Design a protein around this ligand. Structure first.
Ligand SMILES: CC(C)(C)S(=O)(=O)N[C@@H](Cc1ccccc1)C(=O)N[C@@H](Cc1c[nH]c[nH+]1)C(=O)N[C@@H](CC1CCCCC1)C(O)(O)C(F)(F)C(=O)NCCN1CCOCC1
Length: 329
């Protein structure tokens, strides 16, 4: 079997992307954030503290296929400090026609302020490795791990759009969605992420510098976080760019035409157009814009977020020995 679902940006800045997910019987449709940087499928529910709900909720009592997973609890915290926790149910989950039975659906009893404030995201669907799942005492498999036995091929692809809809495919590689061929690179699962090593980078029409950049492919992170030295090299080519302490990163005149940024995948090169790096005005009407490439120094890990992934067709190969594939589009 296979599945195909349309993913849409939640706002005009491409801050995040949501994809419709059907849970339970009859189906209850919720818009989830597909996150390759985490491994929990959790949703706002009838169990969530009322004052913390503003979102479409999952009501397990209305689903004939829902089963409480006795004694199981979960608690997670993300890089930006947000958090949530609750109990667990198993239920039927479908994505773009791909149905999985007995999937663990983590019901939130509480959610942090950032979640309450974002009306567009009803929950998360983790697509990193199962070792990162927060359910205790026994960890639960991701949607992808549960579907592998049924998929035509143990793969899923991400085709994120630039201020436009995109697609998440499960089980097949749509050969009409990309140009040229796909270049695969080794993945390290030591930390539970889709971790890989980029072969280098280039700024604009300048030289490609061969240098190993270990990072993770994360659909759930907005920007492109790279080593401080690499980030400085990029902004040095933008005359009005400066590091702002108050805003939290590099900013530059919105009127500027930004150079492209190239990152290496083995012998292949993926080019991120300059416009993708223009994240948006710091505030509506401002002449100052926020940069899409920022330093990973305070994070501890390099992150190939949406800014980078949306410039390519990405293949997440979940075979026993996983690999990551990149192609231009
Ligand atoms: C707007 C911005 C100021 C530039 S942003 O940085 O705030 N916000 C989010 C994206 C977003 C958009 C719209 C609404 C809400 C949230 C940003 O990209 N979040 C990153 C920040 C980050 C990453 N690294 C360092 N800082 C992140 O936490 N991403 C996680 C998914 C997010 C969480 C908030 C809700 C949306 C999904 C993530 O899962 O991808 C992760 F990888 F970064 C991470 O937190 N993974 C947690 C893995 N855990 C570790 C503990 O053991 C279990 C596994």
């Amino acid at each position: 079997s296979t599945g195909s679902a349309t993913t849409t940006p939640i706002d005009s800045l491409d801050d995040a992307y949501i994809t419709p997910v059907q849970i339970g019987t009859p189906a209850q449709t919720l818009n989830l954030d597909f996150d390759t940087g985490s491994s929990d499928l959790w949703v706002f529910s009838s169990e969530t503290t009322a004052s913390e709900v503003x979102q479409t909720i999952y009501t397990p009592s209305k689903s004939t296929t829902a089963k409480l997973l006795s004694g199981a609890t979960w608690s997670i915290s993300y890089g930006d400090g947000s958090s949530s926790s609750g109990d667990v149910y198993t239920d039927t989950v479908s994505v773009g026609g791909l149905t999985v039975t007995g999937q663990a659906v983590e019901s939130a009893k509480k959610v942090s302020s950032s979640f309450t404030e974002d009306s567009t995201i009803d929950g998360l669907l983790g697509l990193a490795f199962s070792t990162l799942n927060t359910v205790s005492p026994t960890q639960q498999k991701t949607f992808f791990d549960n579907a592998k036995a049924s998929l035509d091929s143990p793969v899923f692809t991400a085709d994120l759009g630039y201020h436009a809809p995109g697609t998440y495919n499960f089980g097949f590689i749509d050969t009409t969605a990309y140009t040229g061929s796909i270049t695969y690179t080794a993945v390290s699962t030591k930390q539970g992420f889709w971790e890989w090593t980029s072969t280098g980078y280039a700024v604009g029409s300048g030289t490609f510098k061969s240098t190993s950049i270990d990072g993770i492919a994360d659909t759930g992170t907005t920007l492109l976080y790279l080593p401080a030295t690499v980030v400085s090299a990029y902004w040095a080519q933008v005359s009005g760019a400066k590091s702002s302490s108050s805003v939290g990163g590099y900013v530059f005149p919105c009127s500027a035409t930004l150079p492209s940024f190239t990152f290496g995948v083995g012998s292949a090169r993926i080019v991120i157009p300059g416009d993708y790096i223009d994240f948006g005005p710091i505030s509506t009407g401002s002449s100052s814009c926020f940069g899409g490439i920022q330093s990973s120094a305070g994070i501890g890990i390099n992150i190939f977020g949406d800014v980078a992934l949306k410039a390519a067709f990405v293949v997440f190969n979940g075979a026993t020995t996983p690999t990551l594939g990149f192609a231009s589009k």
